Amino acid sequence: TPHVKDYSFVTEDNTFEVKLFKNSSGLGFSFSREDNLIPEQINGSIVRVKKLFPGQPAAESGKIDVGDVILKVNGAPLKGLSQQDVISALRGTAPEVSLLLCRPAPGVLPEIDTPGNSS
Amino acid sequence: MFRDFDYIADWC
């Protein structure tokens, strides 16, 4: 799995904060919240990136991958969150969007694969 | 089992 590194400060066994800015219009990235790993503890789901295109706010952000793990959103822990709160936070009135990004090691979590062939 | 509770379909 040829993986090129961008910055040493960025590893796969640590958490790195990700700051963003308010965007406009819809149609863009998508956040998946469908859990199935440990659905034993209701009210405590998690959020992850499902789709993402190059040149998008999340793109220029610096670095993102389909599966990223957000631990905190502008100070909103994954402690019981509605399905309309996250989105609202993405465009919240806040001045800036500061969230924590976590990227565990390869094996802990599965790999997301959306439609599209390969060649 | 072949069922759920809530779903999602919102993006930006």
Side-chain angles (χ1 to χ4, degrees):
Chain A
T1 310
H3 214 93
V4 179
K5 189 126 297 113
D6 240 82
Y7 264 99
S8 169
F9 249 73
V10 189
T11 109
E12 316 187 80
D13 201 327
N14 108 118
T15 316
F16 62 92
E17 312 112 80
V18 164
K19 301 150 159 27
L20 225 73
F21 341 98
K22 56 193 184 183
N23 87 114
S24 339
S25 324
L27 313 183
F29 34 93
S30 68
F31 308 113
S32 139
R33 288 170 75 268
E34 201 179 358
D35 44 66
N36 265 298
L37 279 54
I38 179 125
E40 300 272 311
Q41 304 157 72
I42 340 199
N43 292 184
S45 291
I46 15 168
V47 179
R48 294 189 329 275
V49 186
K50 221 196 95 200
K51 297 202 68 249
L52 232 182
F53 283 116
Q56 269 44 87
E60 84 197 50
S61 203
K63 199 207 205 180
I64 310 187
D65 272 88
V66 185
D68 272 21
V69 180
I70 304 169
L71 191 65
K72 236 182 248 60
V73 173
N74 287 196
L78 275 292
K79 188 175 171 66
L81 232 70
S82 251
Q83 183 257 23
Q84 255 289 317
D85 202 335
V86 177
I87 305 105
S88 164
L90 254 294
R91 234 183 63 199
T93 319
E96 316 197 355
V97 215
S98 270
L99 58 119
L100 310 185
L101 225 306
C102 225
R103 270 184 117 203
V108 193
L109 263 53
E111 309 184 301
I112 307 173
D113 263 68
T114 118
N117 318 312
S118 94
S119 202
Chain B
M1 294 171 188
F2 187 70
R3 226 176 143 289
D4 217 86
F5 218 88
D6 269 42
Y7 318 75
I8 162 163
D10 288 41
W11 34 72
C12 205

